[PDB]
Every structure is written in structure tokens, then in C-alpha cells.
Design a binder for this molecule. Structure first.
Ligand code: ZN
Lengths: 49, 277
């Protein structure tokens, strides 16, 4: 039922990026692994939702 | 004149912000008190000629989306009239004078005078930089030229100077009528990164300190006074919050009009008439 009704999506999993400032606790705005969001993402996974 | 503090601030902040951001050691000095990683990340992202991100400035209520990574929002505030003159006479003039200007110029020889040429008719000369003339020097101003005796000054035949002067509109009499107003403008540095908001605050305070010496707010917009708000989420229900710290800039300035007087009197005349009663 879900495979019939859902649309194909790419799912990628959140984790906090280890670029957070050890004092201020905020992301580095230049971080390449996360583009200023505090959250980095694992490689994408194909799923239907 | 009538004045628009918001448009002044926009016009003044944008070039100054650009010229600081293109100059790495200035930011390195401004941010010396911040955490090392905050400083280096800001300098890497926004600073220097290769900077891939950019800051932006504009008024509130645009119809389009802004650069919420770093944006100075300018926001015209309250004001009130504070001090009035008797008769509302702010000043009087014999010759309608425009804005104050400073221009670079060089001397040239002409007919055994030195002259400086200026782009506009000189309504009043305030200062020729680094020169004080004696009466022997026969200082004269005429049209858009300043003229200066050659005889003793031949060594200066190509001397480079700055002229501080003011335009003239026209040869007319009048009264400058008006009053003083105290007026507020708010500025906030929006960023979705809190450390960027804190750095934009520091940069803005530096810019305003530097601005206090400018001719614009030396002659007008006097007594700059700064107040600072809390850091808070400006918007809270996106995929992320947007933060900012407001600052309020308060200025005292004159609002006035040139009331020209057409009446002129150039001769009294006397007559005696006899009363035979
Ligand atoms: Zn990161």
C-alpha cells in the first residue's frame, strides 16, 4: 500500500556537525560540511514516502 | 533644509561597509576581542576580495526575499522638535548658499597668479588646506576659482591642496526659518547565525564611530546617540530562527526653509515740507 501511494524521495539523516564552536556553541559559518546550519547530513538514501 | 535621516544612513553605511569588508586587517582589528574561531570564521566567510558570501543593506518592507545570512535592515523611527529660535529665525544670509563640499585641487600659474579651480561656484570659502594667507598674498575668490599671488610663492607652482567650501545657489536675501528636531532610526543586523549577528553588531558600532567625524553629521545630524537592544529571534517559525540585535541611532538636526526676501532698499531720500498752520 505505501509503495503504491507514496512518492519517491531521497532521505538523508541529520546529525550535529562537529564544527560547533567549543565555547559559543554555534556553527562556523564557513564550514564546508554544513553550510552554516548546525546540522550535517549523512549520504542520501532512496525511500518512498 | 528638509532632511531624511534614513536615506543618509543608507548612503553612508553602504560604501563604508564595503570598504571595511574589502580590507582584512581592519576586521582583524575590530574583532580582536571575540573568540578566535568566531573571528577566523567571519573573516574567512565575509571578508577580503575573495569573500564568497556578502552583506547587504536596505530599508524594511521590501517585497522580495533578502540575504538573511547577513543583512542590515534600516528602519525609520520616531522624532520630536526640541529647540526653537525666536521668530523661528535659524539664520540669515545675503547670498543663497548650498551644501558644504570638500574637493581636491592643484595650484596652477596663470598671469603671475596662482589659482585653484573648483567644480562649482564658490559661495563661501571655509579653508584652503594647510595654507594661511597674509594680506600681501592678495587672496581673492571669483566665480568658481580661487586666486593667489604668484610673486613670492613660485616654489608652490604645482602645490596640491584640499578646498573646503560651499556652493552658492543665487544672489538673494532671505531668512532661514525652521527648528531643531531630535529623530531616531533603528538598525538591526539580521543573521540566522548568532555569531554572525554579534560580529555584524561590532562592525556596525565601528562604522558609526568612524561616521561621527564625517562632514555630513558634523554640519547636520549632530549629537549622535546610540542605544542597543537584546539579541533575540526576529522570526521563530521557519526551518530555522533568524536572530538580530537592534541598535537605535538618535540624531539632532535642523529642519528649515529659505524664505527669500524680495524687498530691497537702496536709497533714502529727505524732504522738508512747511507747515503754515
Ligand atoms: Zn559544520
Amino acid at each position: 500500500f505505501i509503495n503504491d501511494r507514496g512518492i519517491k524521495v531521497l532521505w538523508e539523516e541529520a546529525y550535529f556537525c562537529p564544527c560547533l564552536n567549543p565555547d559559543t556553541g554555534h556553527p562556523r559559518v564557513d564550514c564546508p560540511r554544513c553550510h552554516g546550519k548546525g546540522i550535517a547530513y549523512l549520504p542520501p538514501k532512496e525511500t518512498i514516502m | 533644509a528638509i532632511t531624511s535621516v534614513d536615506s543618509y544612513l543608507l548612503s553612508e553605511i553602504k560604501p563604508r561597509l564595503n570598504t571595511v569588508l574589502e580590507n582584512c586587517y581592519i576586521i582583524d582589528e575590530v574583532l580582536k576581542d571575540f573568540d578566535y574561531q568566531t573571528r577566523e570564521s567571519f573573516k574567512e566567510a565575509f571578508c577580503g576580495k575573495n569573500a564568497q558570501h556578502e552583506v547587504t543593506v536596505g530599508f524594511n518592507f521590501p517585497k522580495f526575499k533578502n540575504n538573511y545570512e547577513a543583512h542590515y535592515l534600516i528602519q525609520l523611527g520616531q522624532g520630536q522638535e526640541t529647540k526653537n529660535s525666536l521668530g523661528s529665525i535659524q539664520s540669515s544670509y545675503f547670498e543663497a548658499t548650498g551644501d558644504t563640499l570638500v574637493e581636491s585641487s592643484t595650484a596652477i600659474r596663470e598671469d603671475d597668479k596662482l589659482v585653484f579651480t573648483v567644480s562649482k561656484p564658490i559661495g563661501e570659502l571655509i579653508k584652503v588646506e594647510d595654507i594661511e594667507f597674509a594680506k600681501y598674498d592678495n587672496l581673492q575668490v571669483e566665480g568658481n576659482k580661487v586666486s593667489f599671488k604668484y610673486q613670492t610663492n613660485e616654489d608652490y607652482e604645482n602645490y596640491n591642496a584640499n578646498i573646503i567650501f560651499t556652493e552658492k545657489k543665487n544672489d538673494s536675501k532671505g531668512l532661514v526659518k525652521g527648528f531643531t528636531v531630535e529623530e531616531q532610526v533603528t538598525v538591526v543586523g539580521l543573521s540566522f547565525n548568532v555569531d554572525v549577528a554579534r560580529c555584524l553588531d561590532a562592525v556596525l558600532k565601528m562604522i558609526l564611530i568612524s561616521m561621527r567625524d564625517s562632514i555630513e553629521e558634523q554640519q547636520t545630524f549632530q549629537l549622535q546617540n546610540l542605544s542597543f537592544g537584546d539579541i533575540a529571534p526576529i522570526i521563530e517559525d521557519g526551518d530555522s530562527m533568524i536572530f538580530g540585535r537592534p541598535t537605535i541611532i538618535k540624531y539632532t538636526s535642523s529642519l528649515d526653509l529659505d524664505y527669500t526676501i524680495t524687498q530691497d532698499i537702496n536709497k533714502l531720500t529727505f524732504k522738508e515740507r512747511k507747515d503754515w498752520k
